[PDB]
Structure formats: structure tokens, C-alpha cells
Amino acid sequence: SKNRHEIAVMLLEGGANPDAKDHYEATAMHRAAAKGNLKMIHILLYYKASTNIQDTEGNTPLHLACDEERVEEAKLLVSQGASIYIENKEEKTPLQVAKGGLGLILKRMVEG
Amino acid sequence: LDKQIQELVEAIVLPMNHKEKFENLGIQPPKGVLMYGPPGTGKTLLARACAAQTKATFLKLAGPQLVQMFIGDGAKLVRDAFALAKEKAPSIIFIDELDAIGTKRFDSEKAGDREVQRTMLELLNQLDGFQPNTQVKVIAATNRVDILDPALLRSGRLDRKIEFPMPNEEARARIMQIHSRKMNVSPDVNYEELARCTDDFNGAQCKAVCVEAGMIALRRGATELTHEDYMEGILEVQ
């Protein structure tokens, strides 16, 4: 979450668990996708990390990336295999969370 | 009951009389006496009859009377009870069913009985913190002492704890002799057969047998109670 490249590469190199969840059922991709850490998400995807971790409310990291209008994280995560069908307890889709026509390129990158 | 009703009647009569040495040498009479034991003994009507024999003014009051529909009234009835008792002459007041509020339950979330028993703690404040408590006493009786307040160890608090040692036909014959020691009694009563017929009976059940004697007294036509009416009522209602 602090955008520490070398600390993340060295922690994950020693045998860290990418799918490790806290008591709030949130992984490091919720925070990295919440603060705009594009390259951190990318180097997390270098180690074959999952992108569809449900939070305590059910929001995926795509909901937290698109919530803050992160176009690069939306195009990256959706272009890498993010599942938009997984909904939260509020029954909100990633297209409805983002505004300004961002859901149009979300579904465009899902179908394409 | 002479070994316990003698100390009881003395303990409720001499405080009104022995004031001389109570004020000269400062002897503390028993303020709290616990007349407990097995049920059916008739402690309520025996303490009411003895309270009527003390000649002092008697005021009725029960255990669950502290529980009201509203809140804050228990302090009005206890502070007011010791206001009429504080201002008035030394009298006798007997209550019953104290064990219902003297229970130390292990749950600790919330209840209104916490506030009712807190008013009880105000009564213990007015019996413990008040050194002029040589005035009107508070007599309390319980029908069971399975769960009793451990903080009742004080001369002003419930100290005279007298158990009822298996109240056989002698005890029932004596409480019936005190409950019916004034009205028309036949001058031949051995108490052996009529008391022996009473087995595991209650006080209100023996006095209900007496009420049955008053029921067939209309169809007997005699001028005075007889001897066979006791066993006739016992075998009649029970």
C-alpha cells in the first residue's frame, strides 16, 4: 500500500501469501487500488496474484479502483481478467459505481 | 413453639416495655428477626396475631409491594414508611416474602428488580446507617432461605434466625391453640387425635378446617363447639 517496490518484491520473494486476507477480508489490492498504486498492482500480478478478492462488504478491488476514477487501474485490471459480475451486499456493479462514461469502456474492455 | 415463640413474643413485647434499661444502659434490642422455616407454619397469621397482642398499631406490608408500575416510588414508600414510623410512637410492622428480593442472581445485564432491590439497599441504609434506629423495628419473614443475602450479619439487620424444627402435630396444635385460644373451644382437647390427623398440612389448611367447623356448625344445632368437629373438618376438606 505504501508503493514500496523493493519491499514488496523481497517480501513476496521469501514466500509471502498474496491471497492472505485480514480480519476485514481485504487484501493489498484493495489498498493499492484505492491509493492509485498502478505499478504495485502490476508487480503483484507478476507473482500470479488474484484480482477478485471479496471485501467485508463484497466490493472487489475493481470497485475500489473505479470508485476513485482510476482509469489506468480499471483498464489494467479489466484487461487482465477482472470479473465485473461479482457484486457486493449493496448489489452494485462496477459500471454503476464509476461515472463519466467509464462503465462504457469497462464493458467495452470486458466484451473485447 | 414455646422455645421459639417465647423468645419471639418476648423479643416483640419487651422492647416496648424494657425502654428503661434500653435508655439507661444502652442495650440494643433485636431490630431484625428472621422468622423463616418450612411453609404452611402460618407465620403470617401468627405474627399478625402476636402483633395484635402487642397492642401497638399494625400496618400491613408485603414483599412484592415494592414493585410498582412506575419508578422512584419505592423510596417514597420506604422514606415515608420511616417517616410515619419515625414520627409516630413505637409500633410493630410485620412483612413477609422477603426472599423474593433477597436473591443474589449471577446475571448482570439489567432489570428493574435491580432498582427494587436498590430500594431494599436504601432500607438497609436506614437500618444500618441510622444509630437512632431504637425506634419502630422492621420484622421480616421468608418462606425459604435457599438464597439469602450474606450481608445480613448485624444486630440491627436480620440476626435472630430461628428455624422451624420439623413442625409436627405439636406445632400445628399450638399455632391452632393460639389462633383459636379465645373463641368457644370444647373443654376436652387432648390434641393427640385431632393434631395427629394433621399430616403435612398448612396453617391456612388447619384454619380452613376450622372454617369448615363453622360451616357444619350451622347444621349441628349445638350451643358450643365439639371435639369431633376437628377431625370431621380434617377428613371433610382434606
Binding site: - | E10, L14, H18, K21, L25, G26, I27, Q28, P29, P30, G102, T103, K104, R105, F106, D107, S108, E109, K110, A111, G112, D113, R114, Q117, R118, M120, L121, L124, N125, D128, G129, Q131, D149, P150, A151, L153, S155, D159
Partner: protein, 209 residues
């Protein structure tokens, strides 16, 4: 601001806390272990914050909690929850420089070693036995106003009293007075103290559990 009074052998803490608390106490606030039945559901946050809020509003306050071993055992999750509220409201985010609380118990074994931490319970004093000093002293102060016969001898009263307490000897002496009170004699002979104190003292030896 706290103190632990554990007196497993013999009694006498009630005579002390009730002695000074009956003398001045600067206030009255007694918490007896019997008045916490609590058979309803529960919204006691504003209740414990209500009583403790009264202890915060009133500058002088002294709280007694006698026989705390029954409500402080080490249907128990709610008890431990109320004890967690007691921790969070006794060592909480409020200054308690002026309030003082005293907690009495019976056995120092199940006294919640999380509660045994200082702050909540700082001082601890053990009461082993009522030594002859306080025994003969309490006998002299309890024998002051009540007159006795010219034949005075305290060696028999002290000698026949073995393994007793201050309140027990109090109820035995006052019980002996309530035994000689039947013969309405102005003077009190000490032979009836030997008889009545002997028999009632034997009743306290048999019922000393």
C-alpha cells in the same frame, strides 16, 4: 484509588469498613452483591455510565463492593462483558484523582488477575486473626455502657473465647445480655456471662462454618 480486602481466615472487615463508613464516610454509596439480579435483556451502557457519571459529577464519593468473588468468576459471556465494561470505565479515558473505591472479597484465588492489576486495586492487606489487642479492646468498648456486677473477671471471658471474631464475640456478649434480660435484673452477674457465653459460644463453635 482502589484497595483489595481479602480476609479468608475470620471476619472483621465489615466492622472496619462499616466502622469508618458508619462514622463519616464523607458520603453513602453501597453496592451489595445481592441487588444485581438483572433478569431483563439489558441496555446498561447508560446505567454503568450513569452511576459512574454520578461518581464523576459528585466530587466526594466512596464505593464499597463487598463479596465480589461471586460476580468476578474467572451464561458467563455476558458477565465477562459487564466486567469488560467495568475495566473500560474504571481505567478509562477519565481522571479519577478524587474518587475512591474499596472492593472486599472472600478468597484471593478467583479474583480476576486482570482485575488484580494495580490502579483498579492498588492496596491489599490480609486479615489473619483478631489478635488479643483488638479482642480485649473491642470487649472493653462493647462492655462500657453495660454495667456488670462487682465481681469483675475478664480472664474467664477471654479464656473461654478461643478462635472467635469481633462480630461473633459481639453477638455472643449481646446475646448473653439478651439472655439475662429475661430476669429483668438491673445488675448483671458475670456467672450468666459464663453460662450464656459458654453455651452460645458452643453454638458458634458448632455453627462456625
Amino acid at each position: 484509588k482502589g484497595c483489595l480486602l481479602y480476609g479468608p481466615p475470620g471476619t472483621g472487615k465489615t466492622l472496619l469498613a462499616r466502622a469508618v463508613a458508619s462514622q463519616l464516610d464523607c458520603n453513602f454509596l453501597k453496592v451489595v452483591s445481592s441487588s444485581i439480579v438483572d433478569k431483563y435483556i439489558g441496555e446498561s451502557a447508560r446505567l454503568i455510565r450513569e452511576m459512574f457519571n454520578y461518581a464523576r459529577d459528585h466530587q466526594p464519593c466512596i464505593i464499597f463492593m463487598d463479596e465480589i468473588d461471586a460476580i468476578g468468576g474467572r451464561a458467563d459471556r455476558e458477565i465477562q462483558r459487564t466486567l469488560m465494561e467495568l475495566l473500560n470505565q474504571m481505567d478509562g479515558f477519565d481522571t479519577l484523582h478524587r474518587v475512591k473505591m474499596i472492593m472486599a472479597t472472600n478468597r484471593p484465588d478467583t479474583l480476576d488477575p486482570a482485575l488484580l492489576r494495580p490502579g483498579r486495586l492498588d492496596r491489599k492487606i490480609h486479615i489473619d486473626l483478631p489478635n488479643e489487642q483488638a479482642r480485649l479492646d473491642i470487649l472493653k468498648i462493647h462492655a462500657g455502657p453495660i454495667t456488670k456486677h462487682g465481681e469483675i473477671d475478664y480472664e474467664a471471658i477471654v479464656k473461654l473465647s478461643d478462635g472467635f471474631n469481633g462480630a461473633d464475640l459481639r453477638n455472643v456478649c449481646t446475646e448473653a445480655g439478651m439472655f439475662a434480660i429475661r430476669a429483668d435484673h438491673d445488675f448483671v452477674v458475670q456467672e450468666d456471662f459464663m453460662k450464656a457465653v459458654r453455651k452460645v459460644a458452643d453454638s458458634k463453635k458448632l455453627e462456625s462454618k
